Amino acid sequence: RETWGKKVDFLLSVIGYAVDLGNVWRFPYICYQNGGGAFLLPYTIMAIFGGIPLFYMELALGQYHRNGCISIWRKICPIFKGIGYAICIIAFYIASYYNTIMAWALYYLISSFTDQLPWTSCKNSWNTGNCTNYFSEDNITWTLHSTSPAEEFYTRHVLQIHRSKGLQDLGGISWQLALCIMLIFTVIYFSIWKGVKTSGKVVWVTATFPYIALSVLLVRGATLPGAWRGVLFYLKPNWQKLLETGVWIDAAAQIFFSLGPGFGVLLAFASYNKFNNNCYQDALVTSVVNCMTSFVSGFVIFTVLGYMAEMRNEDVSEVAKDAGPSLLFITYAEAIANMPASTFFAIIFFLMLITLGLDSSFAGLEGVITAVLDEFPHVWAKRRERFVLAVVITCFFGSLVTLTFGGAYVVKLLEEYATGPAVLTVALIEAVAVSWFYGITQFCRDVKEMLGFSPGWFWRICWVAISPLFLLFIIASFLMSPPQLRLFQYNYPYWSIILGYAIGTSSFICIPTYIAYRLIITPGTFKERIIKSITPE
């Protein structure tokens, strides 16, 4: 079994997956809504009690077994081998999500090389009728049906969304995105096709350049006027907002998707080295660097919005209420062309925004490809090079659902359910199966023999009491209120919202299906058939 090299590459491989383009969307979009500083406090509380233990449980688990996401559960508890399949099916939906978004950013990177960024002037290709974004000396008014150049650019020059009317009527394919999407799967191919041993050198650059680019972007917006208003708008706490349950759920939700346990990717990474006496030091740095990186991430966005909000004669609130991505692709794009230093930072941000996605997209396929290959050695022994091509082409048709059907109607619908209770259901059962049925005394034993030290009686208290309660809380939060959402003055109908629920519901049907499958073929009586499936090893 191949092993990995320097300890740090590991740390660059995991943090590159830990931080992605999602953190640039949701983290700054959710904080000020939940009170800014009033959201960072529960974000830190739940990160200590909820974030780290589910994060290191998965890394410590792959450390000892070294079996992936499917074959590992033959050793933990045989009744839970369907988790790896559930990760694979859910991965197919998240693989599409992520891969199409970068095509929208790669459309900007190729276009951003031009000195005249087509983001401020509705020149001869836009819906110029509702276009006005030059805030002159009070000879203008903004109507409700009015838009800006960047709103139209993400609207009818990325999505071409006017071609289609909704989920009930879907359009064609954009030729520009059709070339952008293939280049994305090209680099995703060679990064994993060469082998996990070579992917450590791909993350060497992609996991470090964003941290440079954050500094490249932070110094610009910080030195301009208005930054004091932007930072103040973000960090000024709204304490009474913390008393609402929505703040605590969002704080617990952010740490989960920020760290990303239960997705099988962290589990696969720990399966490629013993990590003698160094795993607890590696995982703990990721959780804090991930939380500090997201803090710096949103700190750059509002720092740039502050310079605009001084120019815009308004508050940063009530600005781009539409959605996370629609905010970033439009609003932050406007600021680049409005900063005097344009033609350079258009490349820097939308080279890291792709790199944050690519690095995190490289890591995604490794979790799936590690899982299936550990089960089928007749594929890993000779077809490991061909198996990657089957997944990349499989992910290509997965991503094609968005492009040739008109625009983002599939993405936002797939957003709310592809990463919904399914990934939390997986993350829950991974915690329950490893702790309750598989004796946590044995898991604490398996880890402390590898690390030369045991973290028991602190983490354990959190693992058996705090972890199932605060993972079931996120489940119980979702069944109460249906998120009737919108996209650009178009409310989604009822049948599509149930379809997204059906896709998200069926995404984790593997774990009841597999348990039902084994209990039928297993011989014995009702009690004996259940013990054979639960019996570890």
């Epitope: 203008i140 903004w142 049906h145 009015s146 208003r229 308004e314 609130s317 003055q489």
Partner: single-chain antibody
């Protein structure tokens, strides 16, 4: 050309629901916000809510969560505002308005109907006065930093307000050359060049920087 005509007044028992209607004309109904404003008897003006006729969305001050609900019917260019749990504190005159986007300002004003049963602004004394024709000045202070997002109004006795100064330094269309203004951040000043007897009315100092729309305490110039 633009007009906003309300219904007449009415008295409702305390605790029961009360309604006011407003028809619009002279401009596209869907190309503006239908906002509402409160006037407690003998007090300043206060924002009520907002409506988006394109999708029926609404946004309103936190004090009206269990008191009022807003809606429109674009098929007739008519607007409604439903109130519930009516009490003696709600005896007030309500205004029907037009409001475009980015000045988050009240363009025009209806006639107003009588009803019987965050960042804030402040002002100086409500008895500042001087002879006709002299240079007048009013002081307005902000509790927080607002760059230039302030306007000024004129409410004569028995009439509705009207937008006079725009962005704290420019005079709106239909406004004589007498009124000017200036200010930045937290210090805002309203001046009158050669004040006349017709300008004897109540004024207000609005906050445009952020929603909820908030006003000042209100002062009058007499003389």
């Amino acid at each position: 050309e633009v007009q906003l005509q309300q219904s007449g007044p009415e008295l409702v028992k305390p605790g029961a629901s009360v309604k006011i209607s407003c028809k619009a004309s002279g401009y596209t109904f869907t190309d503006y916000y239908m906002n509402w404003v409160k006037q407690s008897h003998g007090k300043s003006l206060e924002w009520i809510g907002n409506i988006n006729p394109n999708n029926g969305g609404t946004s309103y001050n936190q004090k009206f969560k269990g008191k009022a609900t807003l809606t429109v019917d674009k098929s007739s260019t008519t607007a409604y505002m439903e109130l519930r749990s009516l009490t003696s504190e709600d005896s007030a005159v309500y205004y029907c308005t037009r409001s475009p986007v980015r000045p988050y300002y009240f363009d025009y004003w209806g006639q107003g109907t009588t009803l019987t049963v965050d960042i804030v602004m402040t002002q100086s004394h409500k008895f500042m006065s001087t002879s006709v024709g002299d240079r007048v000045s009013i002081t307005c202070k902000a509790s927080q930093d607002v760059s230039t997002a302030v306007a000024w109004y004129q409410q004569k006795p028995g009439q509705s307000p009207k937008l006079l100064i725009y962005s704290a330094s420019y005079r709106y269309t239909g406004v004589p050359d007498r009124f000017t203004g200036s200010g930045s951040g937290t210090d805002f000043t309203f001046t009158i060049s050669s004040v006349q007897a017709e300008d004897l009315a109540v004024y207000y100092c609005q906050q445009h920087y952020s929603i909820p729309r908030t006003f000042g305490g209100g002062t009058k110039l007499e003389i």
